[PDB]
Amino acid sequence: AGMFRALFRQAVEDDRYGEFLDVLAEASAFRPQFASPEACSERLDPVLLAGGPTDEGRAVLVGCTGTAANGGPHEFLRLSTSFQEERDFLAVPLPGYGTGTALLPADLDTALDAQARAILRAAGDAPVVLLGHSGGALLAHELAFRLERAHGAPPAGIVLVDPYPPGHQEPIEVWSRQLGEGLFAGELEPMSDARLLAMGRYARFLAGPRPGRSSAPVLLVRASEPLGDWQEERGDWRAHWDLPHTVADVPGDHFTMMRDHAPAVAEAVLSWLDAIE
C-alpha cells in the first residue's frame, strides 16, 4: 500500500525499528488532531468479548488495546474465550486508529480521558479491572491513573502483561527487529500509513516521563521464554513493574504468551481477581 509501510518494511529489514518509530512520531505531528476529550471523532464504545455468569458486584475486565498498527478489535479474542462464563470482558479501542481516518490525540491525557468516559458508560457501576499487553500494559496503567485522579473512579486492579516501562526497556529494544517482524507477520491486511502514524505517536507518548502511579493493585504477568537471543551477562531480560501486588509467570514468549498460551494468562488473572475480592 502506502510509502510509510514500505519504508517501515525496509527499516525492519535493516534492523532500524527504533529509528523509524521516531520518524513516525515526528511525521505524526502533521496529522489532524483533537485536543479536548469531546472533540474526539470516533465512538470508543467498548466491545463485550466474553460474558460472566448470571447472578454480585463482581469486577468487569477491560482490555486496553495496544499500539500495534496491525492491531485493533481482534487483539483480545483468543484470551477472552477463557473468560467466558467467568468475567465480563470489554475491549476498549485506542483513539486515532479507526475508520475517513480518525483524528489523533493531542496528548496522551486527551486520549485516556476519551477512553475513561467510554468505559464508565459501559461498566455502569461494576468495579473495573484494566488489562493490557506490552505497550497496552503501559497504557492500562496510565489509564488507571487517569480514572483515579481525573474521574474519581479508581479501578479495582490492573493486569500488566509483559510491560517494559521506561528505564527497563533494554531487552525490548534489543529485540526490536522481532517486534517489527511480528507486526508484518500479524498483518491481516496492509498496515495503513494512518495507523503507523498513530503507532509512532503513542510510542512517543509512552516513552516520556509520566511519574504518577495508580493506587490500584497490580498483577504482573511475565513471559518465560526470551523473544530473541540474550547474553546471560546482560542480566534479566524479563518484563518488569515496580512493587506489584502479585507476579505470575506463564509459558511462551512476549508474543506467544497471548496466543497459544493465552489460557495460562487467563487463569493467573481469574485466581488473582478472586483473591483480591
Added chain:
Amino acid sequence: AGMFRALFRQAVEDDRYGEFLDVLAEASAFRPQFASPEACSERLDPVLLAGGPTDEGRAVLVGCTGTAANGGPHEFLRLSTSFQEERDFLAVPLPGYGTGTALLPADLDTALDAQARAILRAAGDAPVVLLGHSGGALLAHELAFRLERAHGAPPAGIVLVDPYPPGHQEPIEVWSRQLGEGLFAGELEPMSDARLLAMGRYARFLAGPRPGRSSAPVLLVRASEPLGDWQEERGDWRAHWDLPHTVADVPGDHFTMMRDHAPAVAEAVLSWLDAIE
C-alpha cells in the same frame, strides 16, 4: 495521493515547511539506494531541448534539474525555446526522481558522478556551460566542481539563476510559506511520495558543508521582485553568489522569473556566452 503529500500540505498551512523538509530527509534514509554511479538504476540520458546553428567549438548549455518534487522534464521547456537556433540545450535528469521506483543516491557526490558521466558522453568534444535555477543552481555549481576536481574537466561556465547558498538564506526562511505554496501551485499532477523523499534528501545534501569552489566563470541571474514581504532594514533579500563574473537582473520573482520571464533569462545567458568566448 500519498500520506507524505497530505502531511506536507498541512505543514505548509501551519508555516512549518522547514520542519517537514527535515522529516522527509530522515525518512528518505529508508529508501533503497545506489552507492556507485554504475549502480544507478535509471539512465541519465540528457534530453536535447534546443538545437544550435549548423556550422565551431561553441559551448553547449546543460540544464541541471532542480530539487522540486513537482519538477522533472518540463522544467526547462519554456527557457529552451529561446535557445533554438542559438545553442544546443540539454536537460540532465537528477537521480532518484524517475520511474518500479528510483534508487536514491547514497550521497550527493554519487549522484553528481552519475550526471558527470552522462554529460561527458552527450557533450562529446563541446565545452559545457551548466545552468540551474534555485536548488538546481546550487546543484549546478556542485556539479561544476565535481567535473573539475574528480573528472579533470572543468566546464566553460556556470549560470546560477537565483541561488540562495548556505550563509545567505535568511530570505528563503522568511519566505518559507510562499516557497511551500509555490510547490503546490506548480503541480501538474500530485507530487508522489517518492519524489518528496528525493526532495528532502537532496535538500539535506545541499545544506551540508561543501567547501569546493569551481574555477569556472559564473553568471549570476537574479529576480527583481521579492517573493514575499521583507523589511529592507534586514539587508538584501536578493540571490547571492561570491565573485560572479557577471550579474544580470531579470523581471519577476523567484518563481515567475523562470516561467513568465524565461526569455529575459535566456537573453542574459546568450549575451554572456558570446562575451566569454
